[PDB]
Design a protein around this nucleic acid. Structure first.
Ligand SMILES: [Cl-]
Ligand SMILES: [Cl-]
Ligand SMILES: [Cl-]
Ligand SMILES: [Mg+2]
Ligand SMILES: [Mg+2]
Ligand SMILES: [Mg+2]
Ligand SMILES: [Mg+2]
Ligand SMILES: [Mg+2]
Ligand SMILES: [Mg+2]
Ligand SMILES: [Mg+2]
Ligand SMILES: [Mg+2]
Ligand SMILES: [Mg+2]
Ligand SMILES: [Mg+2]
Ligand SMILES: [Mg+2]
Ligand SMILES: [Mg+2]
Ligand SMILES: [Mg+2]
Ligand SMILES: [Mg+2]
Ligand code: NA
Ligand code: NA
Ligand code: NA
Ligand code: NA
Ligand code: NA
Ligand code: NA
Ligand code: NA
Ligand code: NA
Ligand code: NA
Ligand code: NA
Ligand code: NA
Ligand code: NA
Ligand code: NA
Ligand code: NA
Ligand code: NA
Ligand code: NA
Ligand code: NA
Ligand code: NA
Ligand code: NA
Ligand code: NA
Ligand code: NA
Lengths: 119, 145, 115, 246
RNA sequence: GCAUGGCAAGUCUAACCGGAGUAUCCGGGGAGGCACAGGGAAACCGACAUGGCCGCAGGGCUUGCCCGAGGGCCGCCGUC
RNA sequence: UAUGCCAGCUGGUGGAUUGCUCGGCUCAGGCGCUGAUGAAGGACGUGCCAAGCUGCGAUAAGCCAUGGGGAGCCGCACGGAGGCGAAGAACCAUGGAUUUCCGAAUGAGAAUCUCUAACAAUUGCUUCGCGCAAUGAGGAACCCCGAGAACUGAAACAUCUCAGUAUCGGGAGGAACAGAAAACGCAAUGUGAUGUCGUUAGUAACCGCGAGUGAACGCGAUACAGCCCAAACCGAAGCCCUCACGGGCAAUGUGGUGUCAGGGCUACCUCUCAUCAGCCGACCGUCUCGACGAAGUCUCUUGGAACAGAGCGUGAUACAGGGUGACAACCCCGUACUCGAGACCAGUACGACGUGCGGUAGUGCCAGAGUAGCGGGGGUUGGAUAUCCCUCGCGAAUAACGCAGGCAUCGACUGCGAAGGCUAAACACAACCUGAGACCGAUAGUGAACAAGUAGUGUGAACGAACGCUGCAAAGUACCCUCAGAAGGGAGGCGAAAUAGAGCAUGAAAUCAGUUGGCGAUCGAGCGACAGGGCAUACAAGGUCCCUCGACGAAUGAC
């Protein structure tokens, strides 16, 4: 499908398990070398560094990952509400980089290490 | 710029009064209507004429004028030379879907030619002989009596 | 509104020659090529053979075609010749482009127009 | 004329005779006609729905109510072309023949002519191509067909002082207009055409603005994109020889 | 009909086939069409690759006198 | 100077414009039947809170298995509460479970409910018992068989034409239908089942011989494939149900033989590689889906944000397309390459099992009847004497015969065996899957980008709209004053921007409020064009203009 309308549509209507690929981020030079992958599906355990927003430069732990909106919440990357409350500023994984990985899952770590599959 | 391209703004696009370009009345009727009345002019007259013989009782002769054969004798290097001798049947195109090959005598004959065909016209023979030539009638040509 | 850039250049060259040199044929040929293609000459060999004479260059303000027989040893100059025409003519004489004619004879002398 | 053959290092390595066709007088009007036809012949048929606007029993009330005689339904005008939601009076139609014919001779002549335009450094420069060479087209050893990496074709091109053209084509243009909504957002300059003999060059195809072709079927379009003669081309020893009979 | 363009006593392929960069495009395909002879209801027969004269353009010459394509007027030929 | 005229400014109204595309439109490749084992469709249900849509079915946004997938999830739908998921959830694929009522609707009745075991009805078989089975209805069009107009054209109109069209009745399939010559008839020493495409050709033929209508043989292609009965001669050697026993069918003939390379019979020759039946059973290709998949997120500047400019550098069998806070091969998806799976091709091709092909001589043993053919009356066709069909009446031969070769009869010649039957492939459509685009871009394009066959109209058949856009991120406006007030207003807060503040991008015109310039309560109406005066005017994008005098000085031309 080379047609723009079809491309955007299949991205917006992709089933839940096809959305993991919409929340992937590039890996730090070290991590790329370590596992032989250029990027990974950001998990709510990883530590990441913002490379593009107004928050570019800051680092923090991923607090939440929303598949439907393909967005993540990074600790301390927030907005000041009128009442004074502090709420998260959704980030696109595309403007983020993973510097640390939460590998408590045998499956995730397994996928990372193998050379025939990516996590 | 084309004529069509310049019609915007003319209202009538060349048709004259806007009351003109309507239906078939502006053409005196649909198709050939009136070919015998208001528009008889320049229509061949009404009527039947002659008859036709059945398509499969008709013979189609494949012809060629001596002029054509003669103008290309030297050029037909792939065809007998003697005291030239050419089998017309091998020259004429359409000589297959043809009931027979006939040589007609239009033009000149500047060479001595020995022609073989299914038929010839007086003019063709006179010319081919007059140039010190001969005309040989094929076996199919054996249909003269 | 000619489309062929070559035909266009030939026409301009024919003019440059009729003006500078004393030529009159070149300008005449130029005006005929400027007219609609349907009016350009289309001559077969039979006509060239009938009205041409040696040492007088035949000039066709169009194209020469291969029907008929040419025996006279003449030089024919045309806009173009069919493949067969040019072959038959070079066997007894010489087929030449109007562009060469204008060069070997910009005065356009000893020429005979055939259409 | 002579054709200087080059090896994969960009160093002269003998020379062959540039075939006659490269002397075919350049005819840009015929070349333009050939490209125009090739472009028309790949266009797809289209047209609005035969019944768009006609799916209604709308009727006109005629005289009597101080209203124009326009078909209406549920007090809403319909069907007629001046009516909103009405039919399109003279719309695009599927039945229309959008193809262009072209005599084989006229087309083959254009092919030969576009080939020839390729051997004229001045023409190639006017067409717009960037390069610092005097000879053209660029002829190379059949070994070129064995290259596998794009990068290697790059070095060879830089060595042949022709890489500048790819630099030229290394710029996409985001077109003005709605073509963008139909997938035609980008467009870019046409650079070097690579004519091989056995198979199109896989190693050169992804080069910016480059097009790969084969001698037996290279056409007017790849030889003269958009109908403009004189494309910076690079033939193959064998390719050059095959083209001769086209 | 016309303008432009290819080829020219020829010209063009249709469906379709092969290739491929796969609706483009390159190669093939002349089946068949129109043109190359007409006249006659039909049977059937079957024509000027030029014989004469004017003469435009153009060419030539010793500067009106020649040669004069095309064009025009005749002859002559095919057929009913 | 009120009422007011003209133009502008600030604010509004309105929703044009430009930009954008979750929708259309069209083309292309693939694929293609469902249903009594109750379909399609509809009704009513089903969620913690649930009105619409979607899903599902009392196991009700779901239950189970296997594979994939993965750290999240609890549909559209971003609330509140609560919950699920490493016992691997969500989600995807395949298979299974559940699957209310009406609905062909089938126990009977009924506007989706009700009444007291049910294939209702029609059929085949039949253990004659609904015991075993069939049919019904649906489907985008395509396909086959029947019924069959009129407007219109002929410049009126009747035959003709529109047209065997619209529409109606019946029915199949994934494709139908056709199909192995009683053919063709470039007449031949020739072709060789059938569709279809190109051509033959607007030719032959028809026709108030008007208007109009309109083939075929052949040829070039596509794809190719050829067979089975009836009968003769045999005569129960046979078939169906059932595990079996047993039952049923069948001399009104099951079965063997045989089918124009005629066959059978009798006597021979040779031989099987034909055919038919059954077994096995794909490659390749094509369509779709999936795995893996290279290279910058470096410097300075602008910016709310770099995907911008300048600089430095990289990959490329990958510089298609998309996303990401602005123009991105190197940030993310993907894309090239390679690989895997399913579907279709196809229960086909190949291979193999069984059968046995064929030839000579003799033999009038066999070879499809209301038929071939004629007549009356119609329809239909280009079919003209010479199309195809219907209807009423009449009506033959038997291969030593018969039909055809575009009028009839007789002879000759050439072709061919009707009145029994089957048959793959090449072609139609577009529901369904996918791909594509010099198509449209929200009054367009579907009626339908939105609640869309929705809201709504009609007793009913049927009819039928309009409505797209905050922002990079909801940061979707806390607190205070005012007020009858969760309204509104004031002040204030967020953001690059609130004149982005909720139907919120831009924000035209008609037009409205306020206001500025000009005119204005003694004066006349196509509202202007051209001349010339008043008054008015920030810059920018135009820079000229006034008066003395002098130079030049056409026509004309004095006191
Ligand atoms: Cl006749
Ligand atoms: Cl001529
Ligand atoms: Cl035949
Ligand atoms: Mg890995
Ligand atoms: Mg519309
Ligand atoms: Mg625009
Ligand atoms: Mg032929
Ligand atoms: Mg019931
Ligand atoms: Mg009428
Ligand atoms: Mg009449
Ligand atoms: Mg008809
Ligand atoms: Mg026929
Ligand atoms: Mg049998
Ligand atoms: Mg009729
Ligand atoms: Mg609409
Ligand atoms: Mg009513
Ligand atoms: Mg707005
Ligand atoms: Na006119
Ligand atoms: Na009019
Ligand atoms: Na008329
Ligand atoms: Na009359
Ligand atoms: Na409608
Ligand atoms: Na009105
Ligand atoms: Na079309
Ligand atoms: Na031909
Ligand atoms: Na399907
Ligand atoms: Na609900
Ligand atoms: Na179900
Ligand atoms: Na039943
Ligand atoms: Na029963
Ligand atoms: Na009329
Ligand atoms: Na009337
Ligand atoms: Na009639
Ligand atoms: Na033939
Ligand atoms: Na990004
Ligand atoms: Na009858
Ligand atoms: Na016959
Ligand atoms: Na709208």
């Amino acid at each position: 499908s080379k047609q723009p309308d079809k491309q955007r549509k299949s991205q917006r209507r992709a089933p839940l398990h096809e959305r993991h690929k919409q929340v992937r981020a590039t890996l730090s030079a070290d991590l790329r070398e370590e596992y032989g992958q250029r990027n990974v599906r950001v998990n709510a355990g990883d530590t990441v560094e913002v490379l593009r927003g107004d928050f570019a430069g800051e680092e923090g732990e991923v607090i939440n990952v929303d598949l439907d909106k393909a967005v993540i919440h990074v600790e301390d990357v927030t907005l000041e509400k009128t009442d004074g409350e502090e709420v998260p500023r959704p980030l696109d994984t595309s403007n983020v980089r993973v510097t640390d990985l939460d590998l408590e899952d045998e499956k995730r770590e397994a996928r990372l290490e193998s050379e025939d599959d990516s996590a | 710029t084309s004529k069509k391209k310049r019609q915007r703004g003319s209202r009538t696009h060349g048709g004259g009064s806007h009351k003109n370009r309507r239906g078939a009345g502006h053409r005196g009727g649909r198709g050939d209507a009136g070919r015998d009345k208001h528009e008889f002019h320049n229509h061949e007259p009404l009527g039947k004429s002659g008859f036709k013989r059945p398509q499969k009782v008709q013979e189609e002769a494949a012809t060629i004028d001596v002029r054509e054969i003669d103008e290309n004798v030297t050029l037909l290097a792939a065809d007998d030379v003697a005291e030239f001798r050419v089998d017309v049947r091998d020259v004429v195109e359409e000589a297959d879907d043809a009931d027979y090959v006939k040589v007609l005598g239009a033009g000149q004959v500047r060479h001595e030619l020995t022609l073989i065909a299914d038929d010839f016209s007086e003019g063709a023979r006179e010319k081919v002989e007059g140039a010190g030539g001969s005309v040989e009638l094929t076996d199919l040509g054996e249909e003269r009596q | 509104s000619k489309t062929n850039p070559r035909l266009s250049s030939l026409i301009a060259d024919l003019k440059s020659a009729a003006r500078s040199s004393g030529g009159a044929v070149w300008g005449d040929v130029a005006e005929r090529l400027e007219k609609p293609r349907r009016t350009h000459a289309e001559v077969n060999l039979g006509r060239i053979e009938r009205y041409a004479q040696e040492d007088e260059t035949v000039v066709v303000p169009g194209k020469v075609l291969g029907s008929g027989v040419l025996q006279k040893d003449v030089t024919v100059a045309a806009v173009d010749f069919s493949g067969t025409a040019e072959t038959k003519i070079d066997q007894v004489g010489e087929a030449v482009s109007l562009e060469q004619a204008i060069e070997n004879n910009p005065e356009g002398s000893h020429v005979r127009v055939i259409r | 004329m002579q054709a200087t053959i080059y090896d994969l290092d960009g160093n002269t390595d003998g020379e062959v005779d540039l075939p006659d066709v490269f002397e075919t007088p350049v005819r840009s009007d015929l070349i333009g006609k050939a490209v125009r036809a090739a472009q028309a012949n790949r266009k797809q048929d289209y047209g609005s729905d035969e019944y768009a606007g006609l799916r209604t029993p709308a009727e006109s009330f005629g005289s009597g109510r101080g209203q124009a005689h326009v078909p209406k339904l549920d007090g809403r005008a319909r069907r007629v072309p001046q009516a909103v939601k009405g039919r399109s009076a003279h719309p695009p139609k599927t039945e229309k023949d959008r193809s262009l014919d072209l005599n084989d001779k006229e087309r083959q002549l254009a092919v030969r002519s576009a080939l020839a335009a390729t051997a004229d450094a001045d023409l190639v420069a006017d067409r717009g191509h960037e390069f610092d060479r005097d000879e053209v087209p660029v002829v190379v050893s059949d070994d070129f067909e064995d290259l596998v990496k794009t990068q290697e074709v790059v070095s060879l091109l830089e060595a042949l002082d022709v890489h500048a053209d790819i630099d030229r084509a290394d710029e996409t243009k985001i077109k003005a207009g709605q073509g963008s909504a139909r997938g035609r957002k980008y467009r870019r300059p046409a650079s070097i055409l690579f004519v091989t003999s056995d198979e199109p060059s896989t190693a050169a195809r992804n080069l910016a603005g480059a097009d790969v072709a084969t001698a037996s079927e290279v056409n007017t379009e790849d030889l003269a994109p958009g109908g403009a003669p004189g494309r910076l081309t690079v033939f193959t020893e064998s390719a050059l020889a095959e083209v001769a009979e086209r």
